[PDB]
Amino acid sequence: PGTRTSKLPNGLTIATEYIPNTSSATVGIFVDAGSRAENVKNNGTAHFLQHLAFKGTQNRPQQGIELEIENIGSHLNAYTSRENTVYYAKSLQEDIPKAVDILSDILTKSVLDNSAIERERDVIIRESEEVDKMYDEVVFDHLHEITYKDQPLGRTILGPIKNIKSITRTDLKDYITKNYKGDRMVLAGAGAVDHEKLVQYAQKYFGHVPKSESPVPLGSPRGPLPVFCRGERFIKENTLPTTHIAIALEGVSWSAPDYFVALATQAIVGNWDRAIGTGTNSPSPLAVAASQNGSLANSYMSFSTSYADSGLWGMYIVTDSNEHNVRLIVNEILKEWKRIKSGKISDAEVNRAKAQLKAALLLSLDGSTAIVEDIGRQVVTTGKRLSPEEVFEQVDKITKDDIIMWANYRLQNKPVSMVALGNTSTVPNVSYIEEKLNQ
Amino acid sequence: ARTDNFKLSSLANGLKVATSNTPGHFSALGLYIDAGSRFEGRNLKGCTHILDRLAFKSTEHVEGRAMAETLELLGGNYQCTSSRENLMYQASVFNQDVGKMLQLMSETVRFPKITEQELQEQKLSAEYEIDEVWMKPELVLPELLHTAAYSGETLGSPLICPRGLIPSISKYYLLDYRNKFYTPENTVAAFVGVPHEKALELTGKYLGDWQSTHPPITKKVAQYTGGESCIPPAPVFGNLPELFHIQIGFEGLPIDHPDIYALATLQTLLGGGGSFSAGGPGKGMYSRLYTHVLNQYYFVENCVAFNHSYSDSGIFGISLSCIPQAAPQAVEVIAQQMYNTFANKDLRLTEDEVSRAKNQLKSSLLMNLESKLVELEDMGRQVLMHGRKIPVNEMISKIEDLKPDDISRVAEMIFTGNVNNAGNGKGRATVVMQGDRGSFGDVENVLKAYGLGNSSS
């Protein structure tokens, strides 16, 4: 009952959750790495590696990996974030060991053929071109760049085209040698899984991994805490039909004691879409204002992003480049945050938000894959897994007061950073935002 | 069955109550009604859609606003959906809230108010929804396939309500539909992670005194006819490439038919997809449609095998999307693929193909069942249809015992037009397409040229 844990001699942590009445499972290897472990010339390597890890290992050619997974009915996948590198598999319980084997093989014994490395440069460029058509993604990459100015967290995951064209097999092997240490990784499993056996297979297939020489427990401080830099970037682009704005303030990290309170406050502001509404039976004064007299925007979305040592909390706005005065929708958002700071919120909306939050965090923990995802990410970024019942408790105890407290701390006399893409002439300044907000 | 911790019983009024699994981090529950577009006939067309869009509005004992708000406080993870053979109300909620959610479900299922305003709202909103559905080929083609496969009756009765019929859906027809189908004997209450004893308590408390209206039994068996149909080419947008589409099928099997596992394996062995297929291994790039079609012809942007299986009939076949220029080759390409599954002594199905397709089938079933909501829906529909829940073990075993000949025998049976379901369907093919009709050529002649289908009854 709950999540069993074990540490291998090289530092690797094995976290598992057995699911009764199942015959399948998910296993995944999580590494504290990602793009935040790269430098300016290095930037884009982790993602590049993710494409290559499927092109062949010292034990299996590309087509050999695919064909093997397909024959037993398993699934192989992976992703790179600013904080982690993750590879995972889904399979019938009989194939779990075959899965751990293949995961270790793909993560640590990848061939990295020079021909492959060149053919892929093109795939990544294509990839980057497509992301450029996703205005929300673009706005958020820029926001990260100016908010975490000249810091690791401020860099994108794909990296600049310049680096995508210059990354060498050396860069790749270097990144691997530097970051893949047992004390920086978690092997997480859920479903029809035997914790003891999974630990053995872990040692067998992952035991060869180098321990860092200066080991640090999974959730302990990397080094100097990222620092939130106030800033603004107006990216004028008069050809876009819609204008996209992101406004942020220093948020909360995964382990912050006020983590859930931050999410609860995000839920109290919520989202809105000009066509769909709020997704709630009763709209906040903000949602009502946004929809009034012709509408003030096309939509707005509250967001909270967390990292092991930092976080961003704010609003993402999409407006009609020809019909909306962005300044009007921004006034309303600030007014709403000030409403929270002033305590003018009902018990009902606070309980509505807690219910929404509980649902989003717990009812979504359905299959083994979502559960492995929660186990792996929590342990690799925090060093532990709060159980569904512990998370429920953390949300259930939140009070109207905790929220008011939290907003007055995080949204009063604090720096803000902002990015705008499209028709920028109607977009207000960052000092404008801070004036009205702190006012 | 046994490991499921599956239990089933009935209330005095005929309502079946099914529970399974053991306690967990949260629970799931739902009310399943044996209704759907196949039972609408011409008089109740569109009533299933409107009733499902009216789910959880005001009831006799709960104001609309209070309903909505209490559902939010419960987590908001609920929904009503309907299809050709089902109408279900489902949700997942925290363990302590099962009773409150069952109460709300029973209220909208037994005492909906359906005011003029609520009805006028859903009707207006349905016209817009129908206009959008007709722009999505992924939704339109399957609809045309069914309509022609059964000549617009039962399983082929429109799932998408004709636009011009929406304004005449009155409260009267909605009440007629409810009085015919919403009866305890035509309903199942299922729960996952809730002790059976507790489920009987709550069910008796909210649905126990519900009484039947003893309506006229109007459920017709599906009669597969086969047929053709073609709608005009879709408008050419901006950068998007222009594509023609075609779907070709034959009558398939009922979901409880003995050869259903062999048939699903065949569908997995053909597999296929979009010429893009984004994702890691295990996606099915080694299935025949990828190998013999996508990887061979790119004027083909999509090619996949479908298997619609219902209570008394089904449709099995292949879907293909291609550039207008290739249209003339579409039928033949598809006919060859079907032919090669049983009639080509040199392309017989191999141990490897069948073994892989088998594991992939077991895999998607089991992995999908990892979700409580899916376990719930699967249990509810199974009980609604044949009053029992086939246990997983049995399902797996029947798949593992399959051998190549089994798949070949079933492939031949389907493609030869030799299926004998209760409705005694013709062995004629169903061919439905979007593009200029001329571009596809003599469709019937190509299919006969491959010995597909059945001419003489």
Ligand SMILES: [Zn+2]
């Ligand atoms: Zn990529």
